[PDB]
Amino acid sequence: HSSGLEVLFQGPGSTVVATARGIFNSNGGVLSSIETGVSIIIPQGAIPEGVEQEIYFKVCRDNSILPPLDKEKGETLLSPLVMCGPHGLKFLKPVELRLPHCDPKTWQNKCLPGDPNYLVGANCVSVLIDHFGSGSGVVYGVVRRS
């Protein structure tokens, strides 16, 4: 039993509930998405000079996706999916992507006001992207093993 980062694919009509977008230049910067809690930090250099790349990640719901995990054993998704804006992107340096992944304790908890955001932002999933693949629905997603 363990959790990690994985790149899932979208088959049917994906459910886009959140959409983060931000044009980034060689200068660098980060793209935060409060709608879900996902933030992408780009190191000063990932993007070349004299260029402007519109990087937007759309956070979808966990319903219209192809989860390779095994729910029969208990596996599942505890992190909001993501849809890479541009398809076939290649940075000069890897970008740090962070997702709002909480502990498995709240996997089915009603969520109390005492600390419903405690680890929601602490145990975030970090993934480095130098180049973003190009697929019909190359999305991300935390894999909850069983």
What domains lie within the chain, and their CATH numbers?
1-146 (2.60.220.30)
Burial class (CB in 10 A: 0-12, 13-18, 19+), 44: exposed
Residue/partner pairs of 124-127 with CB below 8 Å, 24 or more apart: 124/37, 124/98, 124/99, 124/100, 125/4, 125/5, 125/79, 125/97, 125/98, 125/99, 125/101, 126/5, 126/96, 126/97, 126/98, 127/5, 127/96, 127/97, 127/99
